[PDB]
Design a protein around this motif. Sequence first.
Motif, PDB file in Angstrom:
ATOM      1  N   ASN A   1       2.318  -6.400  -3.324  1.00 41.69           N
ATOM      2  CA  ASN A   1       1.471  -7.331  -2.584  1.00 41.69           C
ATOM      3  C   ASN A   1       0.692  -8.220  -3.518  1.00 41.69           C
ATOM      4  OD1 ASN A   1       0.542  -5.128   0.199  1.00 41.69           O
ATOM      5  ND2 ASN A   1       2.443  -6.242  -0.307  1.00 41.69           N
TER       6      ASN A   1
ATOM      7  N   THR B   1       0.777  -1.910  -1.376  1.00 39.12           N
ATOM      8  CA  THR B   1      -0.578  -1.678  -1.862  1.00 39.12           C
ATOM      9  C   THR B   1      -0.575  -1.027  -3.242  1.00 39.12           C
ATOM     10  OG1 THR B   1      -0.632   0.457  -0.686  1.00 39.12           O
ATOM     11  CG2 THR B   1      -1.487  -1.480   0.471  1.00 39.12           C
TER      12      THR B   1
ATOM     13  N   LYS C   1       2.772  -3.119  -7.990  1.00 35.36           N
ATOM     14  CA  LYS C   1       2.128  -3.444  -6.718  1.00 35.36           C
ATOM     15  C   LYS C   1       2.720  -4.742  -6.148  1.00 35.36           C
ATOM     16  CE  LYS C   1      -2.553  -4.266  -4.922  1.00 35.36           C
ATOM     17  NZ  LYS C   1      -4.002  -4.199  -5.233  1.00 35.36           N
TER      18      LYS C   1
ATOM     19  N   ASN D   1      -0.165   2.372  -3.574  1.00 32.68           N
ATOM     20  CA  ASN D   1      -0.663   3.738  -3.429  1.00 32.68           C
ATOM     21  C   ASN D   1       0.447   4.712  -3.109  1.00 32.68           C
ATOM     22  OD1 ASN D   1      -3.578   3.094  -3.643  1.00 32.68           O
ATOM     23  ND2 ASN D   1      -3.203   2.006  -1.706  1.00 32.68           N
TER      24      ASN D   1
END
Lengths: 242, 242, 49, 48, 245, 58, 58, 287, 99, 49
Positions: free
Chosen positions: H272, E130, H270, E132
């Motif tokens: 994904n 993600t 990131k 994060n």
Amino acid sequence: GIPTELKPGTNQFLTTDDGVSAPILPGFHPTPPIHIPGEVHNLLEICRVETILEVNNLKTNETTPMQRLCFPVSVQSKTGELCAAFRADPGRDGPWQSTILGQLCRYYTQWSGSLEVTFMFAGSFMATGKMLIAYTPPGGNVPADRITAMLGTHVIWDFGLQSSVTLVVPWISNTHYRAHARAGYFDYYTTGIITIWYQTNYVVPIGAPTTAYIVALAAAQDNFTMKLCKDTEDIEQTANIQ
Amino acid sequence: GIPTELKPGTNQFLTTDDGVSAPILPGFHPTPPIHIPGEVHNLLEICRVETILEVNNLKTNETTPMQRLCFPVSVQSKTGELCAAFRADPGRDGPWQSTILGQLCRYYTQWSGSLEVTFMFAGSFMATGKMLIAYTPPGGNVPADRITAMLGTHVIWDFGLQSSVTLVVPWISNTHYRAHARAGYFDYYTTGIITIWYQTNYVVPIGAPTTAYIVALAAAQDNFTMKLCKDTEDIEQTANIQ
Amino acid sequence: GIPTELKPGTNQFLTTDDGVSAPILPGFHPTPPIHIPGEVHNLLEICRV
Amino acid sequence: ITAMLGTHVIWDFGLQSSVTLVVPWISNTHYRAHARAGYFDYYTTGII
Amino acid sequence: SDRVAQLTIGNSTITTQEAANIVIAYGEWPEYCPDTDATAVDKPTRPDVSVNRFFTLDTKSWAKDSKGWYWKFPDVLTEVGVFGQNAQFHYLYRSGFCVHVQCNASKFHQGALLVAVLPEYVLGTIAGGTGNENSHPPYATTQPGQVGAVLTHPYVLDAGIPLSQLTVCPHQWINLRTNNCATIIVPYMNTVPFDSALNHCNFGLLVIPVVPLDFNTGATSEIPITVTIAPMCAEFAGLRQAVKQ
Amino acid sequence: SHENSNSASEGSTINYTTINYYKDAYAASAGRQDMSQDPKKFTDPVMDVIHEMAPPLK
Amino acid sequence: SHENSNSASEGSTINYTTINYYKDAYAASAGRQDMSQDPKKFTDPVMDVIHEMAPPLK
Amino acid sequence: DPIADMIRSLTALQVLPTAANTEASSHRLGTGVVPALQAAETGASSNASDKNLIETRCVLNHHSTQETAIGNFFSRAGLVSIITMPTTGTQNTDGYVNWDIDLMGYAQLRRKCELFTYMRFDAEFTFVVAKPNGELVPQLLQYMYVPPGAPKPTSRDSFAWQTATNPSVFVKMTDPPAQVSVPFMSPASAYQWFYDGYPTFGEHLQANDLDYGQCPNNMMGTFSIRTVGIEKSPHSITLRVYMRIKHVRAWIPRPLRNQPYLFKTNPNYKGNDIKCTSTSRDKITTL
Amino acid sequence: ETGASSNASDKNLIETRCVLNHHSTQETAIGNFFSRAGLVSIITMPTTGTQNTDGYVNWDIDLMGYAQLRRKCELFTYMRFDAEFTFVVAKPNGELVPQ
Amino acid sequence: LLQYMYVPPGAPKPTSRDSFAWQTATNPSVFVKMTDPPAQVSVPFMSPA
Ligand SMILES: CCCCCCCCCCCCC/C=C\[C@H](O)[C@H](N)CO
Ligand SMILES: CCCCCCCCCCCCC/C=C\[C@H](O)[C@H](N)CO
Ligand SMILES: [Cl-]
Ligand SMILES: [Cl-]
Ligand SMILES: [Cl-]
Ligand SMILES: [Cl-]
Ligand SMILES: [Cl-]
Ligand SMILES: [Cl-]
Ligand SMILES: [Cl-]
Ligand SMILES: [Cl-]
Ligand SMILES: [Cl-]
Ligand SMILES: [Cl-]
Ligand SMILES: [K+]
Ligand SMILES: [K+]
Ligand SMILES: [K+]
Ligand SMILES: [K+]
Ligand code: NA
């Protein structure tokens, strides 16, 4: 005191102004420099270096991006088939965006010069073939057939010990410089279209793959220059960097 | 008046700016200078002067601070014993803080150069002995035993009419300059470890003390320089000075 | 700093003042000029027509 | 990976059908007597 | 006469009958550190032939679905032969390298490996997917040792940068129909004259199959890739006891 | 401009490349600092000079 | 004014026509940039130099 | 004498003020010569030029190469930091702020620097300050540079602001923006945007893997700021810091970042959502 | 005991290489160490209180009230110099008014 | 306090008062107060013609 008079511009901060500012550490001396290989002085030094073109930039590739770094050729059943096509516009969205050349010229508003695309055949040694690679200057959309493309600037490539061939995209413009082309009024600056056709056929004997790939590398030639430094569209601070 | 234009920096007061300011007493003449011994021109002149290192900086000493100015040696019962150890980092908290060198380099952000520690034996004339003093450059924590320490830069000291010996802490760094080392990322700039071992033994005949002391003096060598002037952590106005 | 004294006119913007202003693009080089017929230098050239 | 630490040649097959490994004279004595199991293994030349 | 070659250094010699020239990174040959640039005052040890020779590491197997591998320098050799021993006993190290990657197939196989040297190859994580999570690569990933490691996302070189532009770095290609090896000579590159062989990896060697291996079934399927490297002008300083990390 | 010689540092100017627009020298900037040193008066203030070769006590 | 040589770029000055009013060189402007280039180290870092005439592999 | 065994760069600099010219060429028909054929495996880029592939006219090219000199590419002030001192909230109702100097927080400048592995330069810092809505008020500020090892102020009136040795700047929010020159300060010969290593020795347990990539030679200390006064100021303050590289040298070009930035200290991306460097289309045979 | 510091250098205690050292000694010249403006006094004239509701203040010049500068000067016994004094004034909360 | 920025063809246009584009790392920008005199700059000849 000496009579002076403040003029417009007074107190402004121009980010590109090349002036003199007071030094914070008087008498400070930097660490001496030492020799380090690879010094560059001008971005043009880099633009002359070939990097990989994503000719195979399909929507179906996005999840297996590696497949975008090379496109295929395979035993044809029909003659004169079109193998691939793409615009030569280097500052435009598309295949060129993957090259260091493309990325760098996006930091400039205008460019001028001849480009160069070198194709490397990565099939088996037993595979042979002849391809016709063409550059069609402004005016005509993608040539419908090989016999039409053939009328432009082109190279007929023969597979052999020399794995590669170089197509030259000579600077053929009306203006001395081109701004980055994109749909709309700015299509006026489009460079043109590159098309790759089967001159004969990909031929292979019993025992070797019937499909192989070609890698396309692109870069600028010596008459290439860029001007009017600007910010690139290719990077964004979508969110805060922590 | 002459056309001028104010640039950024206008009206600012930079504490280190070396400019010209109007004189308050026109035609004033200072008292003439007279000759006075001891003029200094460069802090480096002082850094070359040996001052006392507090190697014996124990928590149990704090109330009898004088005991910190020298450490002991005494008749050993076992061979190869470790006598004392400490870091060579001069700008770090520890033994070096007691030296004028340490205090002064704390007024600079970086330093470079070889250091020098001179040990003076203050036992009785009848006492003899051989010690192995070693400097272990970065990488290995405190050597476990004398046979390991022995692999680094070292000096084997023999007691005699020459009361002292000098250990050289040669500048052995990767960078041209080191910033002050401290636990954390900055341990990258640590200088290393000094260890003092019994090469043979402190030997004394009947009638002389079985324990004696050594004073350690430290200073910089001629290739020592400092840079990036800064404020010291070593002084604080905890409260108002009346 | 050097003793100066601002005189009247200070801060004004005179539309016909022929001065120097800071350049926004350092090291920039214009497209070279090419020959074009019909250059004029003085309005009088036209008034004679 | 252990053999690699000694004197060696990396041979590539091609038009040149052959390659030559050199067993350089690396002895303590100026001459070697014929080696065989026992005290005379002192004169062994080594392993290929 | 450009396809044939021999590399002899120390007690080792490499031969190849299908080369494609040799690359000298950034046009500079490795060299010992000169007195003007040096800073450490101790006389260094320059072992010469015991360390400037060819070492062959573990071999990898190229499959129709391989992602690609990488090795870090000088990590790969910190525990091999006399070179490793010197790297452990000294705080300071410095050297250049001759990298020779080998891979031969048959005139009926096809594929193309991109062999490149990337200075200061810092790796990144996928940030918990993600993005994060501020995760970091574990020692084993940043310094994989002589076995090297596997790229999980070659397209971005596991570092958020495009493989498509890696050719801006010293490189060669091993295109099976053309050659069977790549050779790159690398000079010392760093912001300091000498450095720790343990804490800092000067560059990484990447071997990525940009054009996948392929062949008709029946043809040999075990197509290995072997890496042989040789330190050049290895110099060491700041002697003390041995340290592994 | 040729000034009054009233700078605090003139007996043996520790500076020497200063800037100034006033008639009094002390108004001048600090200037570039010179790199003279004489560490011996602090590090070796001994009468018979001890060499770094023989033992300092003979 | 004759200054202290402390600019970051002096080993082989990438600039050379700067303006300055302070004793420290690093305070100077950027100046006019020189047009030196050496693309060969990036475009042709090969040992035997391949010509653009014969085939690059003989 | 009694033991015999005990006894460079092939490319350099040229000045190219203008793009190369084009010499006129005609047809070439023959065997042996074949400039269009290359071998990209060598690692070299193609040496072929227009005149070898087509018939060219003569062109006296005067296009300048000056604007692409790294100096003109970098010497443009860019935002490297935004510091805020609000009067109400959990932020800094203290009247002062200590900022660790790290310029990798803003993409525009960062991507440009990361085009190179090592860079050495001097810099001009400009400090643009105002209230958060852009208005200006007669507020006196003090900016101070606290090098590594110098005591950091702990309050609006900490002794550290005596600034007897550290360099400080005193300016009003109403004066133009303060501006100063900073020299090259690393203990190394150059700042490095990429350091494939660890700062210290030891085992690198997953607990301290945040050490990876941290180069102390780039850690320049702290930048502190406060409203100058013993009593709290009623104004929220917004300070934008711009940096302009000057007197620059650069080494070892690398691929340009092609995934959004996530953190100041590493290249994490990131996973994904891995973006393709180029936009896509439906077919390889259609535009 | 002589009172002199050691004369030994690296080359006498170990085997050294040659090093052409270009590190500058300029930043440690006393001039660069001292010529940095430092705080020597804070004077206040408040409008209410026992302080100075008089609108004026007489301050006896004594610069030894602030440690940072004082410790630096006390490194020496005697000093001779000229000085640049800068006067930074504002309301106690840092605001400025036409006074 | 105002900021004027030049966004050449192809450069990202700011989409808000705080768009990243105002970082102005390459585009030329001018920061000036409504109270300062009027900002003034020199612009070169920029057509590709
Ligand atoms: C009184 C004004 C003081 C202004 C002082 C500013 C000093 C800043 C020096 C610039 C240093 C270059 C940045 C260096 C390293 C990068 O930030 C690294 N990525 C941090 O890890
Ligand atoms: C119109 C502005 C007038 C400014 C006049 C300032 C004069 C100050 C001269 C500096 C004298 C140096 C300090 C001398 C002695 C120390 O304060 C002593 N410790 C006091 O006992
Ligand atoms: Cl006047
Ligand atoms: Cl374009
Ligand atoms: Cl006038
Ligand atoms: Cl230290
Ligand atoms: Cl001034
Ligand atoms: Cl991938
Ligand atoms: Cl100076
Ligand atoms: Cl310029
Ligand atoms: Cl204060
Ligand atoms: Cl902003
Ligand atoms: K300025
Ligand atoms: K003044
Ligand atoms: K103007
Ligand atoms: K020309
Ligand atoms: Na050719």
